[PDB]
Structures are given as C-alpha cells and as structure tokens.
C-alpha cells in the first residue's frame, strides 16, 4: 500500500513532536504523586482530527504523476523535514525543560508536606489519605487545577510548531503534483 509511506512521514517528522510532549506529561501523571492525586491528564489529549487526515484534505485529487514524483524526490523531502525538525526541537527544548523543572519544584514541596502525615497516620495512612482524592481537600484540588493548567499550557505552546511542521510537509507533497 502506497499510503503507508505517507502515514509514516507524518508519524516520524510531525507527530514525534507532540508525542515527545505527551511523554513529559505521562512521566508525572504515572509517578507516585500522580497515583496519589488520582490525576487524569491524558483523558482528552489526542487530536480530534489526526494529522494524516489533515494531509489528505489538503491533497484531495491524486494522480500517478504525484506517486512517480514521490519515489524520485522522497530523499529530498526526507532530508528537508529532518533538518527542520531538529531546529524546532532545540527551539522548544527550553520550554520542555521549563515545564519539567517547574513541575519538579512542586513535587518537592508536596512530598515534604505528605511524608510527615504518613508516619503520623501509621496503619491508617492507606484509607485516611483517600480524602486527598476528593473535593474537600484544599491541596488536592489545588494540585489537580495546577496539573490541568500546566498540561494545557504545554499543549498550546507546541501546537503552532506541529502545525508548521505539517504545513511544510503538505507544501512539499503539494509541489510534487504540479
């Protein structure tokens, strides 16, 4: 199937940017703190429309000329997208570092406030700390709100970069039809 290579181009050169950000969110969501807070951050993270569908909309008509040009000029397309991707990753790296660094600061503050309570509760720590997952807990609600704020801010920050990568990939494929 010739469409497999088209999908692989998006998965490797435009989708890898957003999947990198998902790893940063999932690192803290699945940690000890995330389990204790009952965090649900990845419930609504996938795009409603996949990037492959967006590429097909911009390239409605297709002819054998495009496929012939694709085979000849995939090497040039692959090299250009790889160079552009490296530029974006380095440019967005400080924001990703900022996202992880500011999050890790909250983890240190949280741990020093809950570890003393675990010793005090003794055998009751398992069930008493379940209140931290409910609405009445001030810190638990604050952590969940800050968790949503950080992940949504990260998603909107790299969204223009993913659109720019997809636009260049669409423009490169559009030029092959002529």
């Amino acid at each position: 199937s010739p469409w497999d290579r088209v999908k692989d181009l998006a998965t490797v050169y435009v989708d890898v940017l957003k999947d990198s950000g998902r790893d940063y969110v999932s690192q803290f969501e699945g940690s000890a703190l995330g389990k204790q807070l009952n965090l649900k951050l990845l419930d609504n993270w996938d795009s409603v429309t996949s990037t492959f569908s967006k590429l097909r909309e911009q390239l409605g008509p297709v002819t054998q000329e495009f496929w012939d040009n694709l085979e000849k000029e995939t090497e040039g397309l692959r090299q250009e997208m790889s160079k552009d991707l490296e530029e974006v990753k380095a440019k967005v790296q400080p924001y990703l570092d900022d996202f992880q660094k500011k999050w890790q600061e909250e983890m240190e503050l949280y741990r020093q406030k809950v570890e003393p309570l675990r010793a005090e509760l003794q055998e009751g720590a398992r069930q008493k700390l379940h209140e931290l997952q409910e609405k009445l807990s001030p810190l638990g609600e604050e952590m969940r709100d800050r968790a949503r704020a950080h992940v949504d801010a990260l998603r909107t920050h790299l969204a223009p970069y993913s659109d720019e990568l997809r636009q260049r990939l669409a423009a490169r494929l559009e030029a092959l039809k002529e």
Partner: antibody
Amino acid sequence: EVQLQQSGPELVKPGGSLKLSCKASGXXXXXXXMNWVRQSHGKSLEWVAXXXXXXXXXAYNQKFKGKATLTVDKSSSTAYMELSSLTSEDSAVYYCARXXXXXXXXXXXXXXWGQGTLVTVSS
Amino acid sequence: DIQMTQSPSSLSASLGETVTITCXXXXXXXXXXXWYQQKSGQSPKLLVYXXXXXXXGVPARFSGSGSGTSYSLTISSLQPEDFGVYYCXXXXXXXXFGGGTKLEIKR
C-alpha cells in the same frame, strides 16, 4: 501569627436569620479547610460543618444538614456561617477553627480557634 | 458517624493528684484523635493530637494513650492552669466531639 477574627455578639429575633463572619490572617485562606463548632452554655462542643475555602465544598453533619449553610469569600479571606429560622435553642457560642492539616486532608485536628461569636435569640 | 463518650462527666481532684480521662470510640479510629482544653469563658486550645503527640507549650505532665477503642488522657500532678473543661475529638470520619469533662479543684 495565624489568627481568626470573628464578628461581635449578635441578637436575632425568633424566626429570623443569622450570618457570622470569620476573618483569617497570617496564612493562606484557600490552603486549609475551615470548621465551625457550636457550644451552648455549659454544654459540649458540637461540630457543625466544614468548608473548603479554595473550592467552596461543604460538609454538613446530620444535626445541621439543612439548618446551617457555609459560604466563603475568597477576596476578603473570610468564612461565613448562616442559620435559617433561629429559635431559643439556637442561642449558643459559635467558633471557627482552621484544620491543622496543610490542605493534605479535610477532616483533621483543629489547630487555631477563633474567640467565638455569642448568639442569643429573643423577641 | 462515630460517637465519642467520656466516662467522667465531672471530676474533682486536689492539686498534684493523678487523674485519668477516658474517651471511648464507637468504632476503630486508627489513632487520629485530639484533646482540647477549655477554660471558663475561653476558646478551646489544642492539647494533644494523634492521641499521643502533645502540642506546643504543653507540659510533660499531660500524656495520652491508646488501648483499642478507649483513648485516655492522663495528668499526674495537677496545676491551677490544668483545671477546666476537656474534650476529645475523632478526626478519621466527619469530626465529632465527646460529652465533655469538667475538672474542678477539690478542697
């Protein structure tokens, strides 16, 4: 230091309504849950309800499930308690006390107490 | 929905005499119990939390213990400041208080 300032004594006629004030200072109002305790003259302390200042969630006991209503004003950092259709039996002293937990838990020990507001109902 | 019951409704003891106040729980509380000391015409003050951890400024005379469902508060050598009213509270479920114990000087 951390302290809670309550309103002065209140006189309400039978069948009327009442609203108490509890101003917090020296700490983060939204950081800890706020409790209300009712004590009649020469009687035991009675837990009324609790309020999460950050979110507004309220937890009432069976005695004051519908008779009492708890609200919070984030901007003024004050907690309010409201009683509906007071009677002579409602004449007591009402305290507001902050939960000792730093937001980790809602129901815990009461760290700092307010001086209390005296409530007397008479026509 | 757990009720605290204190056996001594009112106790009179001389200065320096040992006295024990017992707080009974309708169900298992897994520690998380507090005692409050209230003076005449005064607000309650936290005395001991977690049923065994004395608060700041509390003298070593005060002590707490837990043996099953009966939590006990013990004062061995009474002082004039120690006389007043004491209450116990449960912090596991929705908070509740005991019936109260009024301590008075015996002469």
